[PDB]
Design a protein around this ligand. Structure first.
Ligand SMILES: C[C@@H]1C[C@@H]([C@H](O)CC2CC(=O)NC(=O)C2)C(=O)[C@@H](C)C1
Ligand SMILES: [Mg+2]
Ligand SMILES: [Mg+2]
Ligand SMILES: [Mg+2]
Ligand SMILES: [Mg+2]
Ligand SMILES: [Mg+2]
Ligand SMILES: [Mg+2]
Ligand SMILES: [Mg+2]
Ligand SMILES: [Mg+2]
Ligand SMILES: [Mg+2]
Ligand SMILES: [Mg+2]
Ligand SMILES: [Mg+2]
Ligand SMILES: [Mg+2]
Ligand SMILES: [Mg+2]
Ligand SMILES: [Mg+2]
Ligand SMILES: [Mg+2]
Ligand SMILES: [Mg+2]
Ligand SMILES: [Mg+2]
Ligand SMILES: [Mg+2]
Ligand SMILES: [Mg+2]
Ligand SMILES: [Mg+2]
Ligand SMILES: [Mg+2]
Ligand SMILES: [Mg+2]
Ligand SMILES: [Mg+2]
Ligand SMILES: [Mg+2]
Ligand SMILES: [Mg+2]
Ligand SMILES: [Mg+2]
Ligand SMILES: [Mg+2]
Ligand SMILES: [Mg+2]
Ligand SMILES: [Mg+2]
Ligand SMILES: [Mg+2]
Ligand SMILES: [Mg+2]
Ligand SMILES: [Mg+2]
Ligand SMILES: [Mg+2]
Ligand SMILES: [Mg+2]
Ligand SMILES: [Mg+2]
Ligand SMILES: [Mg+2]
Ligand SMILES: [Mg+2]
Ligand SMILES: [Mg+2]
Ligand SMILES: [Mg+2]
Ligand SMILES: [Mg+2]
Ligand SMILES: [Mg+2]
Ligand SMILES: [Mg+2]
Ligand SMILES: [Mg+2]
Ligand SMILES: [Mg+2]
Ligand SMILES: [Mg+2]
Ligand SMILES: [Mg+2]
Ligand SMILES: [Mg+2]
Ligand SMILES: [Mg+2]
Ligand SMILES: [Mg+2]
Ligand SMILES: [Mg+2]
Ligand SMILES: [Mg+2]
Ligand SMILES: [Mg+2]
Ligand SMILES: [Mg+2]
Ligand SMILES: [Mg+2]
Ligand SMILES: [Mg+2]
Ligand SMILES: [Mg+2]
Ligand SMILES: [Mg+2]
Ligand SMILES: [Mg+2]
Ligand SMILES: [Mg+2]
Ligand SMILES: [Mg+2]
Ligand SMILES: [Mg+2]
Ligand SMILES: [Mg+2]
Ligand SMILES: [Mg+2]
Ligand SMILES: [Mg+2]
Ligand SMILES: [Mg+2]
Ligand SMILES: [Mg+2]
Ligand SMILES: [Mg+2]
Ligand SMILES: [Mg+2]
Ligand SMILES: [Mg+2]
Ligand SMILES: [Mg+2]
Ligand SMILES: [Mg+2]
Ligand SMILES: [Mg+2]
Ligand SMILES: [Mg+2]
Ligand SMILES: [Mg+2]
Ligand SMILES: [Mg+2]
Ligand SMILES: [Mg+2]
Ligand SMILES: [Mg+2]
Ligand SMILES: [Mg+2]
Ligand SMILES: [Mg+2]
Ligand SMILES: [Mg+2]
Ligand SMILES: [Mg+2]
Ligand SMILES: [Mg+2]
Ligand SMILES: [Mg+2]
Ligand SMILES: [Mg+2]
Ligand SMILES: [Mg+2]
Ligand SMILES: [Mg+2]
Ligand SMILES: [Mg+2]
Ligand SMILES: [Mg+2]
Ligand SMILES: [Mg+2]
Ligand SMILES: [Mg+2]
Ligand SMILES: [Mg+2]
Ligand SMILES: [Mg+2]
Ligand SMILES: [Mg+2]
Length: 245
RNA sequence: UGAAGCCAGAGGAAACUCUGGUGGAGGCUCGCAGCGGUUCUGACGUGCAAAUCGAUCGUCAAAUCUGAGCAUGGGGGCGAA
RNA sequence: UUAAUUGAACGUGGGCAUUCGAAUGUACCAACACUAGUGGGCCAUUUUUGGUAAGCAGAACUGGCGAUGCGGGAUGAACCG
RNA sequence: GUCCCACCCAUACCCCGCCCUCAGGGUAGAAACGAUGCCCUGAGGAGUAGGCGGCCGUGGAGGUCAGUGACGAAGCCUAGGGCGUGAGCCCGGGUCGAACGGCCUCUAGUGCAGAUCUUGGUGGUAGUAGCAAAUACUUCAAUGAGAACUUGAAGGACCGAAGUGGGGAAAGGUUCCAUGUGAACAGCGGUUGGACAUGGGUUAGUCGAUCCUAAGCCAUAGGGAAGUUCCGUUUCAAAGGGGCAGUGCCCCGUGUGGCGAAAGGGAAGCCGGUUAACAUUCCGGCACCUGGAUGUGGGUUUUGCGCGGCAACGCAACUGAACGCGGAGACGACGGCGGGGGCCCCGGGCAGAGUUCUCUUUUCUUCUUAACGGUCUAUCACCCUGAAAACAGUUUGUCUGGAGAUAGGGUUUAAUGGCCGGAAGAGCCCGACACUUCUGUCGGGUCCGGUGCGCUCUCGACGUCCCUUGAAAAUCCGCGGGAGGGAAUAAUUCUCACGCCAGGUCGUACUCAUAACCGCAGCAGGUCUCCAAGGUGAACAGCCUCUGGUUGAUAGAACAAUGUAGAUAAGGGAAGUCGGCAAAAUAGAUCCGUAACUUCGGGAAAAGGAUUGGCUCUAAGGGUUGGACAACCAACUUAGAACUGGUACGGACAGGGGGAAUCUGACUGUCUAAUUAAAACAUAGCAUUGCGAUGGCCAGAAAGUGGUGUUGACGCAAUGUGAUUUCUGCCCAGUGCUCUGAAUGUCAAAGUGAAGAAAUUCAACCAAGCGCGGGUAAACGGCGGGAGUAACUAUGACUCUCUUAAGGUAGCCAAAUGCCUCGUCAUCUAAUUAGUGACGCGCAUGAAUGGAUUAACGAGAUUCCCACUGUCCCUAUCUACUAUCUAGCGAAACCACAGCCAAGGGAACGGGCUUGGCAGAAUCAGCGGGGAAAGAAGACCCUGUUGAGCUUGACUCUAGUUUGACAUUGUGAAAAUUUUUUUACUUAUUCAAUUAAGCGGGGCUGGAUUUUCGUCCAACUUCUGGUUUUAAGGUCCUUCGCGGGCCGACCCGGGUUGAAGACAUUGUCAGGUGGGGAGUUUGGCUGGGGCGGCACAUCUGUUAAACCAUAACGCAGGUGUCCUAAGGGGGGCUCAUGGAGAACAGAAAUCUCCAGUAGAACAAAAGGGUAAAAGUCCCCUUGAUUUUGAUUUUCAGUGUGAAUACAAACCAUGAAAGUGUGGCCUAUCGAUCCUUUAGUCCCUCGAAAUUUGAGGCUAGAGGUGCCAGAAAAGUUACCACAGGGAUAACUGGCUUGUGGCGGCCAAGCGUUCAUAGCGACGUCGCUUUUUGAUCCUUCGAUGUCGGCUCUUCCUAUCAUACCGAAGCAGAAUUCGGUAAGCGUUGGAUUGUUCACCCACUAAUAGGGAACGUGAGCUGGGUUUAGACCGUCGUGAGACAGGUUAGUUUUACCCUACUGAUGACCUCAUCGCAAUGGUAAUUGAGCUUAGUACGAGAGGAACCGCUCAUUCAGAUAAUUGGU
């Protein structure tokens, strides 16, 4: 046969992300002396919409402690933030919504967002609309914190990893039906070229593992081994189980 | 054609319910150009034309149409298939 | 080989002559080398198998057409001369 | 039928002549000869494939002819001649002008009729097809040889502003303009031209490019790659940019390139005039921007950098360094509203033109004001006073207001607004005179209002939509900051006015299309955009007109058929047809009325009605200024009423047919460009799967490489189903996926141990995988039989049994899924294989391979009803353009030669042959029977040791991935020098962050800590949308300076900071996985192939026709084994059976006698053979051994298998003769290579020797059953090539089982009676309208069903004519004879042939003509490609299973036919008639007659009239149509 559709996606050139309207990426400011021992204060100048994301962004302005300049930086806004709010980031920052604190200085049971797996990786976990990370417990003997991820998985990260108190803004987005092929089309038009999807079972054998036959059907099981050879993975890859839950 | 929102009046004990306006929403509707190409299985079929012409027809505020610049190159691309 | 110079096989020396042991013909002496084309066949008298039968399918002997004209069967690849 | 005479003629026979071939003789003291000759004799003569011999011809080479030739070589033409059997040679005549030939050898690119041969040229067709879309031209004159398509004037028309107009972008390139023109081109002409020839033509500081960046591309640093080069665009880089006087000295630095838009961003030009061709470009006037210099005036300043206002802010200036902050550039779509420019519209006035029988103070035209410099206003908004409920202000739209509204007073962004300048001096319009041209002069004027849901552009404030929020950069400006500098006698802002200089380079013409672009072209196609008048009208709808532009497309004459386009038709109204295909009908606006169903939104324009013109009126709906008023303006909309008319009025144009249902998809949307627009795809909704970044999915040869990702589970990635409602059942055995392994199995390389001299071997251990075990079906998928049973019968709630992983649950159904099947019942109709509603043991329905139901929607499929109609009964008529004739111009396909038939034979359907019929020049218009007409080396089928696409558990591999080992790979500790395990370290390696900014240790400050002095933690910043920078100061020096050092700001270590860490990673091997990918294969025979079978290696009998040989998918069978005896020898005996007899005992037990030719046995099929044996029992043995030869059968006299007779050993047996080299004989089986064994006291390892190891020679075994021996799965309905009529599917040909039809006999039936009418059991035929059988023709194609239309033929006669017979009284009916003259229907269902009904009828007979008839139609079916379902398959896919959508080409050629002319015999009129054609048909009323006949019922016919059905010819008084 020929190269199937999911194989062509890795080359790009029509499958790359559309990012003309996307300005500077959403991430914390680089860890520095001010945040490691103390705190620094910033002002939420304005809350903006970032195409293809679904959660609003907030541009916060800080003061450079060395150069007499204002460092612009785009965070991910939480439910409650507003323009003119003062944002405090550091070890000694107060525990309020929108403040950026190390996870080791935050009590168990809290709710944080934009958690970083590694110290300095400026934001990795809990960044979509209604998602958040819960601090399960501490372990100060070696400086490690046990968190719970939006997927329901527990994980242990460094107690020096940062995070923003609260819940990401825009929650409940996926609770409204799109109702229209347009609404799906406009949703993906600013993200990438992945809509619509033709069904593989409706293709020809040259095009897909499912194609062909005098009836539209899958000849073999839709469950595909974990180590299939890059062109066989056209189903439920490495399914521990199938069927209705 | 007439969705939210808004104005006035009426009925009821209340819950609330009616009437007349205003408003101008919708991958709404008739329909011209554009776009397409259902039927006549019409014309032509050494044609005007290596796919056109006539009537009839589908859509017509949008998943509509479109120019230029750019990208994807052959067991490769691209495909609402 | 035999009981055996008894046999078996092959011979020397003699005898039988061209009537040398039926007819007819010899208008086919024998051997060798190298090589071509061919390796779809078909028809008929007689015999004969399968089949209801076939201008059907398959065999035996012989003769023909293929490769072949000529006179006859008006006409015809095979019939008659 | 037979007999007898004579005669005719074949290439045969006889004689003779001649040619050639073959054979046999003669020919030298040569007077003797192309001796390769001559003379004599005899016989013979066909020929494809093929073989051989001799000769002829062509281009060249050597020799020779003392060769020919300008007094004419070669070539060419020549119904002139000679020679040869022939290929050929020679000569004469004509043309021509320079070379050529014979003979002997040598040599070769050496001989053409074909190859759908190649190249070039030329025909018939043929003066033929044709030059027919876009409404259309006519008169006069000039030019000219010539005028329909040149020009001027006049008339008539068209485009009708989304144009046939005026400009451009792309593209083209001189097509632009003038002058001239022979040919060619402009498919007719041409004086004309986008043609040809010669010249000319494009002027920019202001337009565009140039500048910026976007998507993206390419350098640099680096890293890969054998390399061409790939990645990389800010990285793991010592990257750059400015100041002061070719160098010196300073300051900053986070970061350091280019290309990429003539539509994006952007400094700045307008008006008038001017050329044959340019204009925002030239000329005149009047401006603007940028850059650089620099003067005057003005402004500021003698305590140095302006004043005014409460404020919003203002003014002509009014310092401002580094650094920083902000704005502009800079942004979506849509809606109504308001302002402005332009256009349109309505008045009045000044001028001009048109009309003027009459009328119209009338109809039409001009009445203009640019950039730029000011000045005065224009929405929002903001400021001051003040403080609101009785809430107020306020928009078309409901927003604002104690966060300050109303009100009053102000500030300000915004001009395409008014006024002034520009500027009337311009332009324009009139009138009067100049003039030879130069085109000259003069005068007057160039005005004032209104209206609007008007159109277009633009601006502004609001509003709506988004899980959609709708570019960036160059560049410019403002502010914060306060560096430096700056006068009191002159400096200074050169953000004020004026003054000075300069603005480089390239493009610039023209078309922008029914003739300048692309399509082979001057092609009805395609190609981006701006401006957009009047009327009607809702309207850039259609129709007509103005400005502007065309009048270009071969023309003239007639008006035949058939056409194409436009139409109309009486009565009926789908009866036509597969089907209402096509057409008709409805249609605007206002008022009324509107159902089921429903997701409550719709359906809905449901359905269905009424009105509509003109004229005269009336009323309502406003604005402005002055206090329920008065006066002056305004243009549209609505409503009411009289009158009126041939009751007509959306009068043209424009403009929905509707309803009741079924199947299917929810809807909007999309695709097979050029046969399928769909039920297919998509979609929202639902569900499942993977993944927490050292990750998931994917790319790359590799990479310090990349996409998702400027991403982080409400995300990305992979799938299935397909809105809503209601549900989504059971099964984990099979195949997949997944999880754990404690586990015992299998188990690679490396490593370990043992043996050995070593190579090497062996053993243990042994990762992943497999195996084992669990889960998983919204994973792939699957979801049963048999029997009995209820008080009529029937059925089976119930029971029994086999069996599965589970046995189909809820639902649904002859459904797009049901064969039987046209299922059964009901409804629909007169009639229904159609539709609908039910039923259900459902071949083969069924639940996200989704089940059921669904409102709305559908160029989807289907049925019915109403309306409507030429679909039809049944045709007719009209118009335009063709066809037709003419002038001009002028092809192509096709073509062996050609063109009359009947029959015969023939390769089985002839134009040619044979026998007949016949047959008379040359033609024109039609036509579609034939030329098995043309188009294409059949696309169906088969063959090929020909492919390709796709699939998979085919064979062989492979990228990738997983696991193990070794290297990278280092340093310690702990237990059990080194083993395995754990643990620790950083420097290798890896990852991340950052402008490498603050790390580790200590000190200082504080508190609880034991207060051990000596322990742990902190150490500036948290009511607010402000600011933070170019250090203040302390101390020491100093030129006494915002000068210099240290501190301010603790010391030390130079590890930038974290994570991971000898594990990842990387390199090399090894095991697994791996249709993701690659290569290849997928036997043969065969009454076509596939399925079936094995007739593929072999044996017996028969076919087989008396030696042997001999075929078929002929007949009846067999083999792939079995046996230490069932082999070998010897001896004794006789078997199967029958009779008779003996206790249990009998039909069968064992014993005895007699008879018993084999009727038994001999392993196994059958056939031979055998009796003191070849059978049976007993005794002894291994001849079933060794050595090679000869022979036989199949046969090539090869192999294999098998067999025969000897010879030489060693044996066995017997007293011996003898016999024994497997089985009584005919079947019982296997090469090369490789491996292994036995033997060879053997040979070799090639520098020498020994021992292992290896290789040799002779003989076996391991096996090829496709058996003389390849290692091998499918599908193609997406398909391809070489071929085949060696071979199927359709016609024809032979045959006739089968189908159909007809005879003979006579058992019976018929009241009795074989034969009125039938006729069983038998039996003989005929036809080719059924289907078979066969495979002769056609595979470089004969268009393959039916229907429609039309002609003709047959008889085996349904009706009609005339007759015979009857179980014929009449009537009706049945059988038969002549006879094919003449008829044999309209419909429902089905594509149907057929069938089955309704109805009429004299009757509703059967057939043929290539299953008549596709250059006659249609395309319903069949019969490609799309799609759905059921069953089957793991899958790709298959299905004479069911559905839906799917391009039907060419006549002008010859003949045939239909008509029409026509030469010759002088012209003409009037006639004859050979021959050819021939045409009529049937029924009903009255009378006969209620009569004959007959017991009633019933019930005729002949004659004679009167009409009507079908058919035929003609006609236009009447009616109807046109
Ligand atoms: C089947 C097995 C193998 C066979 C033999 O090795 C086959 C060879 C044949 C030869 O021609 N070359 C081929 O490549 C393989 C042998 O004879 C059999 C007994 C046993
Ligand atoms: Mg498909
Ligand atoms: Mg595949
Ligand atoms: Mg399909
Ligand atoms: Mg349209
Ligand atoms: Mg069309
Ligand atoms: Mg057509
Ligand atoms: Mg034609
Ligand atoms: Mg575009
Ligand atoms: Mg041979
Ligand atoms: Mg032959
Ligand atoms: Mg002969
Ligand atoms: Mg002789
Ligand atoms: Mg001559
Ligand atoms: Mg000369
Ligand atoms: Mg040659
Ligand atoms: Mg030649
Ligand atoms: Mg030739
Ligand atoms: Mg030829
Ligand atoms: Mg003509
Ligand atoms: Mg034409
Ligand atoms: Mg327009
Ligand atoms: Mg234009
Ligand atoms: Mg010109
Ligand atoms: Mg011409
Ligand atoms: Mg001419
Ligand atoms: Mg590069
Ligand atoms: Mg550039
Ligand atoms: Mg540009
Ligand atoms: Mg011009
Ligand atoms: Mg000028
Ligand atoms: Mg001042
Ligand atoms: Mg901006
Ligand atoms: Mg823009
Ligand atoms: Mg002015
Ligand atoms: Mg200007
Ligand atoms: Mg202005
Ligand atoms: Mg517009
Ligand atoms: Mg120009
Ligand atoms: Mg121009
Ligand atoms: Mg131009
Ligand atoms: Mg134009
Ligand atoms: Mg062209
Ligand atoms: Mg071309
Ligand atoms: Mg109007
Ligand atoms: Mg109009
Ligand atoms: Mg024309
Ligand atoms: Mg009919
Ligand atoms: Mg198509
Ligand atoms: Mg179509
Ligand atoms: Mg679908
Ligand atoms: Mg091993
Ligand atoms: Mg294991
Ligand atoms: Mg199913
Ligand atoms: Mg004939
Ligand atoms: Mg012929
Ligand atoms: Mg002849
Ligand atoms: Mg003849
Ligand atoms: Mg014909
Ligand atoms: Mg014709
Ligand atoms: Mg043909
Ligand atoms: Mg062929
Ligand atoms: Mg073969
Ligand atoms: Mg192949
Ligand atoms: Mg395999
Ligand atoms: Mg750092
Ligand atoms: Mg393959
Ligand atoms: Mg075969
Ligand atoms: Mg055979
Ligand atoms: Mg014999
Ligand atoms: Mg014996
Ligand atoms: Mg032999
Ligand atoms: Mg012996
Ligand atoms: Mg024996
Ligand atoms: Mg062997
Ligand atoms: Mg063989
Ligand atoms: Mg095929
Ligand atoms: Mg097939
Ligand atoms: Mg057949
Ligand atoms: Mg018969
Ligand atoms: Mg045949
Ligand atoms: Mg044949
Ligand atoms: Mg054929
Ligand atoms: Mg042919
Ligand atoms: Mg034909
Ligand atoms: Mg007869
Ligand atoms: Mg027939
Ligand atoms: Mg025909
Ligand atoms: Mg099909
Ligand atoms: Mg299946
Ligand atoms: Mg089929
Ligand atoms: Mg006659
Ligand atoms: Mg008539
Ligand atoms: Mg009349």
């Amino acid at each position: 046969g020929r190269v199937i559709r999911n194989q062509r996606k890795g080359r790009g050139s029509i499958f790359t992300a559309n990012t003309r309207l996307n300005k500077a990426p959403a991430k914390f400011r680089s860890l520095d002396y001010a945040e490691r021992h103390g705190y620094i204060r910033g002002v939420v100048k304005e809350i903006i919409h970032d195409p293809g994301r679904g959660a609003p962004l907030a541009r916060v302005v800080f003061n450079s402690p060395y150069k007499f300049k204002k460092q612009r930086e785009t965070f991910i806004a939480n439910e409650g933030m507003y323009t003119g709010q003062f944002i405090y980031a550091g070890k000694n920052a107060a525990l309020t919504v929108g403040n950026v604190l190390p996870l080791g200085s935050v009590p168990e049971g809290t709710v944080v967002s934009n958690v970083e797996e590694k110290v300095g990786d400026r934001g990795a976990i809990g960044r979509t609309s209604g998602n958040y990370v819960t601090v399960v417990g501490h372990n100060p003997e070696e400086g490690k914190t046990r968190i719970k991820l939006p997927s329901g998985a527990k994980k242990v990260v460094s107690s020096s990893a940062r995070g923003m108190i609260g819940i990401v803004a825009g929650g409940g987005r996926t609770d409204k039906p799109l109702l229209k092929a347009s609404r799906a089309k406009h949703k993906f038009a600013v993200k990438r070229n992945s809509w619509p999807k033709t069904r593989g079972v409706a293709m020809n054998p040259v095009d897909h593992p499912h194609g062909g036959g005098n009836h539209q059907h899958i000849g073999k099981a839709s469950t595909i081994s974990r180590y299939a050879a890059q062109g066989q993975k056209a189903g439920l890859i490495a399914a521990r189980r199938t069927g209705l839950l």
